[PDB]
Amino acid sequence: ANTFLVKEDSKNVTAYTPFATPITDSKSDLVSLAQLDSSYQIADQTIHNTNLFVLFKSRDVKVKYESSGSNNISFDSTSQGEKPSYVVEFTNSTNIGIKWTMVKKYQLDVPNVSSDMNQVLKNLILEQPLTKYTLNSSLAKEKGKTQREVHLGSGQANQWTSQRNQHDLNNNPSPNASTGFKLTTGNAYRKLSESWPIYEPIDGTKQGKGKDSSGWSSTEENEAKNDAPSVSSSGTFNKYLNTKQALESIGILFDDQTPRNVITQLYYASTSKLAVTNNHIVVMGNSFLPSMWYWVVERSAQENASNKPTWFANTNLDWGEDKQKQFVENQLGYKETTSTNSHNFHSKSFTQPAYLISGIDSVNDQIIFSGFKAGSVGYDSSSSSSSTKDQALAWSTTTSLDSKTGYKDLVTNDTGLNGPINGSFSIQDTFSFVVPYSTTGPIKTAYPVKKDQKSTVKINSLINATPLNSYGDEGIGVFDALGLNYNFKSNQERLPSRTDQIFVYGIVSPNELRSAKSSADSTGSDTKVNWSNTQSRYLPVPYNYSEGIIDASVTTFSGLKSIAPDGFANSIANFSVGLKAGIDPNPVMSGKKANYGAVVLTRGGVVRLNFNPGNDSLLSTTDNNIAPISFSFTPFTAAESAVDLTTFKEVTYNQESGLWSYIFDSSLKPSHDGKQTPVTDNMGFSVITVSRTGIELNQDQATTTLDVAPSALAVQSGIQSTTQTLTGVLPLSEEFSAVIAKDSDQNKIDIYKNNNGLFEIDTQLSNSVATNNGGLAPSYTENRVDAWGKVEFADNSVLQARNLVDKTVDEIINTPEILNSFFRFTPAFEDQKATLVATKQSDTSLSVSPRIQFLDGNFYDLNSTIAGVPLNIGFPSRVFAGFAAL
Ligand SMILES: OC[C@H]1O[C@@H](O)[C@H](O)[C@@H](O)[C@@H]1O
Ligand SMILES: [K+]
C-alpha cells in the first residue's frame, strides 16, 4: 500500500497519500462495518499481508467473578454488558480507492477457571492502579514485622543466635530484615468482585485503608470525599488525591462516579494490543493495568467460536536461569503439604500470574513481547494471635556485596532466595542496605511463617499495580527501585533485585502459541505452556529522576522527592510502552537471513531487543560473565525525558529508513489533576525517533558471533508542538515528515525537514505541499520552484545547434542522456531528482514530460496513482520537432 492509515477518532480510519491528503471516500466507521454497536471503540490495528486487523472493545462491558460454582468469570448478561472484545480482519475490495469489507470476526471470550485457579482467585486481591498523579508517598506502605518478631516474637535479638537453627535460619545475620508491609493503610487492595476507589492516599503510610475494604466504606471513604471532592466545590486535598478523570484516561470504566469491579477493569485492559502471524492473532493488555491472561486465536477458528485466553499463571517463562524463576515463585506465597485452605499461586504450583505488558508485535511468523513483572506476593488473611496479620510477605532479593561479579553469578546469587536477608548493616565505620556476604557454614533463608502457625495460617496471593514486590517504607526499597545498590569492589558493579523492577521479553514461535491455545482450551485441571525464547532483566527507574537521597535521616518512599520529568508524579515505579519490531534494511552476508530487532520505551531510556534470525532465538554469546546480549538499555537525554510517556499514542517502523517513530499526543492527558484542577497543557504532540547502534550480527565472518549487544538511540526528533491538535504524522522518508494538525478546526500540512539529525519546520515546502488546490497532490507551476522543483525546457533551436536533427525520434528516444539535455532542473531540496519520459508523436517529433521525486523518495509522473486513483498532478509536456526519418 502506497498509503498511510490514520485513526481520525475512536471509530473511523481514513487512508492518506504521501501528500498528506485523504483518499476520497476512504473514511470508514470500522465499528459500524464490524457490525458492533456504538459502545465499541478501536483499541489497536495492524496490517498483515495487505489486510487490516482491528481490535475492538466496548465501554458497556461488565464482567462478574462468583467465588462458588465453576464458571466463575462470566459477562453480566443482565441489562446490556454481554459485550466481548472482538478482532476483525478487513480486506480492501476495490482496485480504485479504499472500500473495507469484513472477512473474519473473532470473539475474545472470558478465561476458563479450574477448581485449583478459583481457590487462588477466591482471596486474590489487586492494588488500585498507578496514575499520572500517584506520589512516591502514595505507594509507600507501613513496614511489617521483622524476621525475628515473626519467628521468636516480642522476645529479643539476644536469643536470635540460640534459636535460628530451630526455625531453619542457620547463620542468618538479619534479625531486623523486613517480612514486608501492612495492608491496613495504603493504596486500596480489592478482590475481583469489588471496586477500586477514585481516591489515592497522599501518604499511604497513614491514609490508606489498604485491603480493609469494610473499614474504607464505613470510616475513611467519607473523610476522603470531604477532603478530595470531585469537581462540580473545591477542596483542601490535605490527605487524598482524587484521580477519577486520570482513571478514565487509562481505560477505567464507570457507572457514574463508581469504577466497575476489578474483573471488569482487568478484562477491558487485557484486550488492548494485537499482533498477527500467518496462523495466529495474539491479544494482550495495556501498560497501565496488570494483565493475567492473553488470547491466542487460530485464524482458522470457525465462523463463530469463543476464543479462550491463556493464564500467565499457566505460562512458564525462562527468566534466564532456573534460579531467577525460583526467586519470583518463592515470593508468590507459602507452599506446604501441611497447611489447610491456605491457597496462593505458589501453593497451587502456578507461576508469575501478572505482567504490565509493553506491547506485542510480529516479525516473520514470530510474536515478540516485553513487559514488567507485576509485583505478586503472599498476604496473611487470618482472623482471630497471628503476628503477620493483614501483612503482605515481601522482601528485597538484592544480591549481596561478596557475590562473584559477572552476570550469571550476580543473578544466581543465593541472597534472599527463600526469605528476608537485607535491611541495614554498618561494616567497619561505613554502611550498606545489602547483606555484605553470601562464619560456621552456609547462610540460610526461610519464608516468614513461624513453624507453629505452619498448619493454621492463611497465606493468599495479591497483585501490585507496579513492578515493585516490596512497598515497605525502608531505605533498601528506595535503593532497589532506583538501582542504587553497589558493591565496594574493583570495577564497582551494580547489585540487582530479581523480585523488584524486573523487565521480561521474548520471541514466541507458532508451536509455543499452539501450546498456549491448548492451555486455554484444557478441560478440567490446568494445562501448562513453556515459552523458552524469553529472558528477564533488573530494570530500575533512573536515580536522577529523584532529588536529595542521603548517605555520606535515611530516605524511604514516604520522603523520597520526585523531580521526574516524564509525566509521572512518582519516581519509583518503572513503566514501558510501544514495543515494536522491524527488519533491518542493511544487507547481511549472503546465505544468512535478514536481521530484525525490537525497541520499547521505559522510564529514562530505550531498550533494544536483539534476535538471531538463523533460528528465531534471543541473541546470546558463550560467556556467562557478560549479560544476556538479547538486551541493551540506552538512557535518554533531557529532551527525551521531558516527553510525557503517558501520552504515548502509536509507534510505526519504516523498513527503508530502519527507524522507529514514537508519536505522543497531549490530547490523551486527563481533563483534571488529582487536586481536581483543569489540565491546560493538553495541546500539542511530540515524536521520538529510534535508530539502531553498534556492530550488528552477520556483517562479515567476524560478526557471525558477537560478545557486545547491539543497542538503540532515542532522539526527540524536533517534530513537536504545544499549540496544535494532532491528526497524524507521516514519516515520508529519513529526510522528511508531514504533520497533519489543526490550529482552529481545519487540517493544516507542515513539512519537517531533517537537518543533520534535527527536524525543523520548512515553511516554504509546507506552503508548496499544502497548495494542492483541493486535489490529492501539490500543484505544479512552471515559473516556480515548488514541491516539484522547477523544470525549464530547452528551446526547439537546440536540435539544429547540436546537429541532433540528423538523429531519428527512435534514436533520441533510446538515449536517455540526450533527452536529459532537453531540460534544466532546479531541486526544491538537495538530491531531489527528475528525468524526462519521451513519447513519439510523429515521424519527426516527440514530447517529453518530467518524472520527479517527491519528499518520500518516490518518482511521480502523469500516470501516477495512489490506491489506484490517478493523481493528475499537472506535469507539463513539451514537443521537440525537426528530427529525421533517417
Ligand atoms: O552478632 C553481631 C555482633 O557480632 C559480635 O562479634 C560483635 O560483638 C558485635 O559488634 C556485632 O554486633
Ligand atoms: K515547478
Residue numbers in the entry: 25 to 256, 261 to 412, 417 to 470, 478 to 591, 603 to 936
Study text:
To gain understanding into the function of the cytadherence machinery of mycoplasmas, in this study we have determined the crystal structure of P110, a major adhesin of M. genitalium and an immunodominant protein of this emergent sexually transmitted pathogen. P140 and P110, which have been shown to be reciprocally stabilized, interact to form a transmembrane complex, called “Nap”, that accumulates at a polar structure known as the terminal organelle. The structure of the extracellular region of P110 is composed by two domains, the N- and C-domains, very different in size, with an overall shape and domain organization that can be sketched as the body and the stalk of capital letter P. Within the N-domain of P110, long connections between some blades and also between some β-strands create a structure, referred as “the crown”, containing a binding site for sialic acid oligosaccharides, as conclusively shown by the structures of the complexes of P110 with both 3′- and 6′-sialyllactose oligosaccharides.
Co-crystallization of erP110 with either 3′-sialyllactose (3SL: where the neuraminic acid forms an α2–3 linkage to a lactose monosaccharide) or 6′-sialyllactose (6SL: with an α2–6 linkage) resulted in complexes of both oligosaccharides with erP110, as determined at 2.2 and 2.5 Å resolution, respectively (Experimental procedures section). The oligosaccharides binding site, the same for both complexes, is located in an indent of erP110 in the upper part of the crown. In both complexes only the neuraminic acid moiety presents direct interactions with two short stretches of the protein: Pro197–Ser198–Pro199–Asn200 and Ser456–Phe457–Ser458. The carboxylate group from the neuraminic acid forms two hydrogen bonds with Ser458, one with the backbone amino group and the second with the side chain oxygen. Finally, the methyl group of the neuraminic acid is placed into a hydrophobic pocket close to the Phe457 side chain. In the refined structures, oligosaccharides present different occupancies (∼100% for 6SL and ∼60–70% for 3SL), which suggest different binding affinities in spite of the fact that neuraminic acid is making about the same interactions in both complexes. The lactose moiety of 6SL is also well defined in the 6SL complex, while density is progressively weaker for 3SL suggesting that, beyond the neuraminic acid, the conformation of this oligosaccharide can fluctuate. The third monosaccharide approaches the protein in 6SL, while it is projected towards the solvent in 3SL. Affinity between erP110 and the sialic acid compounds was experimentally characterized by Surface Plasmon Resonance using biotinylated 3SL and 6SL immobilized on a streptavidin chip.
